[PDB]
Amino acid sequence: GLSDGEWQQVLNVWGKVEADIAGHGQEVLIRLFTGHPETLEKFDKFKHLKTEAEMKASEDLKKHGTVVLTALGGILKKKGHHEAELKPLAQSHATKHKIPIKYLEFISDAIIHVLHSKHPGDFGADAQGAMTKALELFRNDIAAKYKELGFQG
Amino acid sequence: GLSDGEWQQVLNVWGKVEADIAGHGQEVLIRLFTGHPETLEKFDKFKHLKTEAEMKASEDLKKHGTVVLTALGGILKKKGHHEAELKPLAQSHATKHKIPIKYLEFISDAIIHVLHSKHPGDFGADAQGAMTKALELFRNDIAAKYKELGFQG
Ligand code: HEM
Ligand code: HEM
Ligand SMILES: [O]
Ligand SMILES: [O]
C-alpha cells in the first residue's frame, strides 16, 4: 500500500491531469495503442487507426481518453479516502493493541445483536444479512493489512 | 459484495446508530465485554471495570463506544463509496469488453509514461512510485471483482 504522503502525491498529480484532461487522455491512449497495438482491436471505433497523427486527429479517441481518466480518478480518490481511515486503525490494532481477527468477529457479533435488538423494523433478515456482509468486508480489509504488517491476527 | 439495496439497508440502520452513537457504542462494548471477558483484558484503561454495573457507570467506556462506532461508520461508508465506483467498471470490463489484467497493466504503464513525460519535475521518483502502487491497487481491486464475476482476466 501507499503511505499518507504517497496518496497526496497521487492526488496532486491527478489535479494536473484534470487541468488538461483531454490532452492527458489522448496521450495515454496513444501510448497504449502504439506500445501495444493489439489493444486497438478492442475498440470498434479505433481499430483502423495506424499512426499517432491519425490518433491525435480522432475526436472519438479524445473523448474516450477523458472518459477513462475521469473514471480512474474517481476510483483512486475513493480508494484513498477509504485507506486514510482503514490504515491507521489496522496499524494501531496490529502493533499497539494487538487485537486478533477473532476479537473483531466478537465485536461484529455484538454490533449485529445490538442493531437487531434496538431496530428490528430496520433490521429484518435481509438487512441483517447486509450488515453481516459489510462487517465481514471490514474484517477482511483489516486482516489484509495485518498480513502486510506481519501480524498473525 | 453487497447489492445496492443491501448497501441502502446498511446505511439506513447506520442512520439509526447516528441518532445516539454513544448509547449504541456503550451497548456494543458491554455486550462484547460480558460475552467475551478476555476482550476487556485488552483495555488497560478499563482494568477498574469488572461488573456489568461498573461498565454501565463508566464515563470512558461510553466515550470509547462513540470512538469505535464513529470510526466504523466512516470506514463502512467509505468502503461503500469505493465499491460503487469500482462496480460499473468491473461489470463492463469483465462481462462486455473482456479486458485482461495484462491490458490493465499496459494502460497503467502508459499512464506512468505520460505523467513522466509531461510532468518530470512534479512527477519524480517518489511520486512515480506512489502512482505505480496506486495503479497496482486499482488493478488488484478490479481483478478481485473479475473473479467474483466469473471472469478469468
Ligand atoms: C485505467 C483503466 C481503464 C479505465 C478506468 C477504463 C474506463 C472505461 C470507461 C469508463 C468506459 C465506458 C463505460 C464502460 O463501458 O464501462 C470504458 C469503455 C471501454 N473500455 Fe475501458 N477502461 C480502462 C481500461 C481499458 C483497457 C486497457 C481496454 C482495452 C485494451 C479497455 C476497453 C474498453 C472498451 C472496448 C470500451 C468500450 C468502448 C466503446 O464501445 O465506446 N478499457 N472504459
Ligand atoms: C469495529 C471494530 C473496532 C473499531 C472500529 C475500533 C476503533 C478504535 C479506535 C478509533 C481507537 C482509537 C484510535 C486507535 O488507537 O486506533 C481504538 C482504540 C483501541 N481499541 Fe479498538 N476498535 C475496534 C475493535 C477493537 C476490539 C475488538 C478490541 C479489543 C478486544 C479493541 C481494542 C482497542 C484498544 C485496547 C484501544 C485503546 C484504548 C485506549 O485508548 O486505551 N478494538 N479502537
Ligand atoms: O477504456
Ligand atoms: O476499540
- The enclosing domain of B76 has a CATH number of 6.10.140.2100
Quote the ligand 1 centre to B93 CA distance (angstroms).
7
**What secondary structure letter does DSSP report for A119?**
-
Name residue, grid cell 448497501: B7
Q: Is B94 exposed, middle or buried (0-12, 13-18, 19+ CB in 10 A)?
A: buried
A89 and A142 housed in the same domain: no
A59 and A84 housed in the same domain: yes
Within chain B, where are the H helices? 4-18, 21-35, 37-40, 52-57, 59-95, 101-118, 125-149
Give yes or no for B37 touching A (CB within 8 A).
no
A72 and A3 housed in the same domain: yes
H or E, element range at A78: helix A59-95
B10 and B66 housed in the same domain: yes
**What secondary structure letter does DSSP report for B42?**
T
Whether the CB-CB separation of B140 and A79 falls below 8 Å is answered with no
Q: What torsion do the CA atoms of B79, A90, A129, B37 make, to the nearest 10 degrees?
A: -160
Resolution value, angstrom units: 1.0
Instruction: With CB atoms and an 8 Å threshold, state whether B6 touches A126.
Output: yes
Instruction: With CB atoms and an 8 Å threshold, state whether A110 touches B82.
Output: no
Whether the CB-CB separation of A56 and A95 falls below 8 Å is answered with no
Q: What torsion do the CA atoms of A83, A87, A88, A92 make, to the nearest 10 degrees?
A: 160
Q: Is A100 left (phi over 0), alpha (psi -120 to 50) or beta?
A: beta
Which ligand is closest in space to the CA of residue B38? 2
Residues of B in contact with A127 (CB under 8 A): 6, 9-10, 12-13
Give yes or no for A40 touching B (CB within 8 A).
no
Q: Identify the domain boundary among A96, A126, A141.
A: A96
Q: What share of chain A is helix, strand, coil (3-state, %, to 5)?
A: 80, 0, 20
Closest CA to B111 of B90, B134, B89: B134
* Domain count along chain B: 2
Question: How far apart (Å, rounded) are the C-alpha atoms in residues B54 and B33?
Answer: 12
- Kindly report the CATH number assigned to the domain that includes residue B114: 6.10.140.2110
A116 and A51 housed in the same domain: no
Question: How far apart (Å, rounded) are the C-alpha atoms in residues A110 and B53?
Answer: 18
A54 and A65 housed in the same domain: yes
Quote the ligand 3 centre to B106 CA distance (angstroms).
12
- The structure was resolved experimentally with X-ray
Q: Which three cell numbers stand for residue A62?
A: 479524445
Q: Which three cell numbers stand for residue A72?
A: 480512474
Identify residue B41 by its one-letter amino acid code.
E
Instruction: With CB atoms and an 8 Å threshold, state whether B24 touches A114.
Output: yes
B84 and B118 housed in the same domain: no
> Is B93 among the annotated ligand-binding positions?
yes
A17 and A56 housed in the same domain: yes
Which domain range does residue A56 map to?
Answer: 1-96
Identify residue A83 by its one-letter amino acid code.
E
Q: Identify the domain boundary among A49, A67, A96.
A: A96
A34 and A83 housed in the same domain: yes
Give yes or no for A32 touching B (CB within 8 A).
yes
A87 and A101 housed in the same domain: no
Instruction: With CB atoms and an 8 Å threshold, state whether A31 touches B114.
Output: yes
The Cα of A55 is separated from the nearest Cα of chain B by a number of Å equal to 15
